[PDB]
Ligand binder design. Structure first.
Ligand SMILES: Cn1nc(C(=O)NC2CC2)c2cc(F)ccc21
Ligand SMILES: [Zn+2]
Length: 139
C-alpha cells in the first residue's frame, strides 16, 4: 500500500484506489495501473523531472529501502493477476529486487524526488509505474 501527495493530488495504484478516490477522480489509466484523486490538504512530495536510472525504493515486505538500477519506462508484458488479465502495461520500469503484491504503492526516489510507485513483480523483479511524464502534477 502507499501514495504520492503532490499539491492537491493523491497518486495511487489504480488497483488499490478507494471510493473517495474514484469520486474525486482527476485522471486514471488502466494500462499504467495509475489513479490521481483531488485532496483537501496540500501535499509535500516533489516529483522528479529527470531520466535517472538509479534510485532507492521502499519494500514493505522487508521493511527495507533498497538501492536499484531500473529500466527506462516502456511497454512490458505483465502476467495475469487478481487485478488485471495478462496485458502490456505502459510507462513501466523494471529492477532486480524483492517485492510481493502487498508492496504496491512503495515509492521509488532519485536525487530529484519521486520517480514512481511499485506496481508489478515476480521472479526476483520489481516493476514501478513512472509518474515523471505527468507534468501537470506540479501545477
Ligand atoms: C509488486 N508486485 N505486484 C504484483 C502484482 O500482481 N501487481 C498487479 C499488476 C497490479 C506482484 C505479484 C507478485 F507475485 C510479486 C510481486 C508483485
Ligand atoms: Zn532523478
Amino acid at each position: 500500500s502507499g501514495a504520492i501527495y503532490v499539491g492537491n493530488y493523491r497518486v495511487v495504484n489504480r488497483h488499490l484506489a478507494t471510493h473517495n478516490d474514484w469520486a474525486n477522480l482527476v485522471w486514471e489509466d488502466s494500462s499504467r495501473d495509475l489513479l490521481v484523486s483531488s485532496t483537501t490538504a496540500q501535499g509535500c512530495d516533489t516529483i522528479a523531472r529527470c531520466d535517472c536510472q538509479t534510485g532507492v525504493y521502499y519494500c514493505s515486505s522487508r521493511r527495507k529501502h533498497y538501492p536499484v538500477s531500473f529500466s527506462k519506462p516502456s511497454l512490458i508484458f505483465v502476467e495475469a493477476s487478481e487485478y488485471y488479465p495478462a496485458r502490456y502495461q505502459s510507462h513501466l520500469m523494471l529492477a532486480v529486487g524483492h517485492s510481493e503484491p502487498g508492496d504496491c504503492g512503495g515509492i521509488l526516489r532519485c536525487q530529484h524526488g519521486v520517480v514512481g510507485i511499485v506496481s508489478t513483480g515476480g521472479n526476483g523483479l520489481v516493476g514501478f509505474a513512472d509518474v515523471r511524464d505527468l507534468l501537470w502534477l506540479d501545477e
